[PDB]
Design an enzyme around this catalytic site. Sequence first.
Site, mmCIF file in Angstrom:
data_model
loop_
_atom_site.group_PDB
_atom_site.id
_atom_site.type_symbol
_atom_site.label_atom_id
_atom_site.label_comp_id
_atom_site.label_asym_id
_atom_site.label_seq_id
_atom_site.Cartn_x
_atom_site.Cartn_y
_atom_site.Cartn_z
ATOM 1 N N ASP A 135 0.837 -1.197 0.000
ATOM 2 C CA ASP A 135 0.000 0.000 0.000
ATOM 3 C C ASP A 135 0.879 1.257 0.000
ATOM 4 O O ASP A 135 2.105 1.171 0.023
ATOM 5 C CB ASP A 135 -0.895 0.005 1.237
ATOM 6 C CG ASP A 135 -0.100 0.089 2.525
ATOM 7 O OD1 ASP A 135 0.884 -0.664 2.672
ATOM 8 O OD2 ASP A 135 -0.460 0.904 3.399
ATOM 9 N N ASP A 148 -3.437 4.747 2.594
ATOM 10 C CA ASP A 148 -3.810 5.214 3.922
ATOM 11 C C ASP A 148 -3.407 6.675 4.049
ATOM 12 O O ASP A 148 -2.291 7.061 3.674
ATOM 13 C CB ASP A 148 -3.133 4.380 5.017
ATOM 14 C CG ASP A 148 -3.607 2.933 5.023
ATOM 15 O OD1 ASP A 148 -4.707 2.653 4.500
ATOM 16 O OD2 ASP A 148 -2.884 2.071 5.562
ATOM 17 N N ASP A 204 1.305 4.980 2.026
ATOM 18 C CA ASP A 204 0.863 5.802 3.152
ATOM 19 C C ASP A 204 1.257 7.260 2.995
ATOM 20 O O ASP A 204 2.242 7.585 2.334
ATOM 21 C CB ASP A 204 1.447 5.276 4.475
ATOM 22 C CG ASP A 204 1.071 3.827 4.747
ATOM 23 O OD1 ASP A 204 -0.012 3.399 4.287
ATOM 24 O OD2 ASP A 204 1.852 3.123 5.430
HETATM 25 MG MG LIG Z 1 -0.632 1.506 5.893
#
Ligand SMILES: [Mg+2]
Length: 360
Positions: A196, A284, A198
Site C-alpha cells: 500500500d 492510507d 501511506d
Molecule cells: Mg498503511
Amino acid sequence: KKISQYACQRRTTLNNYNQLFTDALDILAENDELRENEGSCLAFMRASSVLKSLPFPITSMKDTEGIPCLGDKVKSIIEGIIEDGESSEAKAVLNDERYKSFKLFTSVFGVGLKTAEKWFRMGFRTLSKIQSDKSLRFTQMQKAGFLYYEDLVSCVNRPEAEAVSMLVKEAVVTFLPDALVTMTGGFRRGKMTGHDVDFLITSPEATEDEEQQLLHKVTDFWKQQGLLLYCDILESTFEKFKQPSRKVDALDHFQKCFLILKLDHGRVHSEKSEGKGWKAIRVDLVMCPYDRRAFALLGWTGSRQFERDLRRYATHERKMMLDNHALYDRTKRVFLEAESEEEIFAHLGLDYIEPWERNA
Ligand SMILES: [Mg+2]
Ligand code: NA
C-alpha cells in the site's frame, strides 16, 4: 563497538547480508503472530531484526558471539541454517495447514485473525470456496477485498506510489493550498515495493475545523470522479494534553482513512509502455495538527520494529513516554517539543538515524 539490543540505536539498510536466517526467522515470527503467541513472536522479530543489521553474513556459530537478542531457541535455528542452508523449523511452518490457510485468508483486505480462524474451523482452505459459498456473509471491507484481490496482491511500485502521491496532492491542494503531503512507510525508507502507499498530511494555517474536514472533502471529491473504490474514515482519538500510555493499546491515533483508489495507467510513468487501463491501490491517509507532525512522521515512517524499540528505549532508558503525537519526560514533568525527527532523536539522547537506515 558493541551492538545495541535496540533497533533505534542500530543502522539497518536494505542491504541484508543474512536473508537466509532472516527469512526463516520472519516466517517463525509470523507463525506465532497468527497463533497469538505474543512472547515467542516478539523474540523471533527481535532476533531477525538484529541480523538484518549486520554488515557481514554469518558463516559459523562463532560469528554470533557478542550479538544480543539471540537466545538458545534462536541459535538452534541459526545452527541448522549454517549446516543444511535451510531451517527445518521454518520448513515445518510453511507446510503447516493452519499457517497456510491463515496467511491466505489474511491476504484478503478486511480479513483479520478472528475471521480467518472462523473459516479455517468451518473447513475452508481456498479463497474460491469462500467466495462461492452461498451461505457466508462478508463485511463491506471484505467484499472490497475480494472484488480487487488481484490488483491488491500485486506489489505496488515506486512509479505507482508517485502517481498516487500526485493524486493526493492535487486533491488536498484544492482545499488547503498550504498543505504538506509526505509519503511515509516503506517507500520513505527506500523500499522498491509495498502492499500500500501511506501519507501524512498537515496544514500550517488550518483550523481545528478545517484539518478535521479535509479528508472528508478529498474523499468526497474522489467519489464524484469515481476514483474511490473503498473508504473508511476513523476520527482522531489523540488528546492534546494526554501523555502517551504504557502502550496499553493503539486505539490512540490521529484521524485517518483506509482507502482503495482507482489508479489509471496513463498516470503511471514507468519504463513499462493493457486491458482495463487502471489498477486498484490500497492507500492510507493521516491528518495531524501542524505542531505534532514530527512525532507522526517518526511514527508512520516505521519500520514496526524501529517504532517498538524507539518506544521501549524511551521508557526503560530515559523514563520518557513516546507517541505518534507526543514525547513526555516523567522526570522533568514536561512535554518535549520537536519541529523535526532529528530534535526528537536529540531529546532521547539518540544519534540520528536516517529513514533508509530504519529498516529494522
Ligand atoms: Mg498503511
Ligand atoms: Na488482511
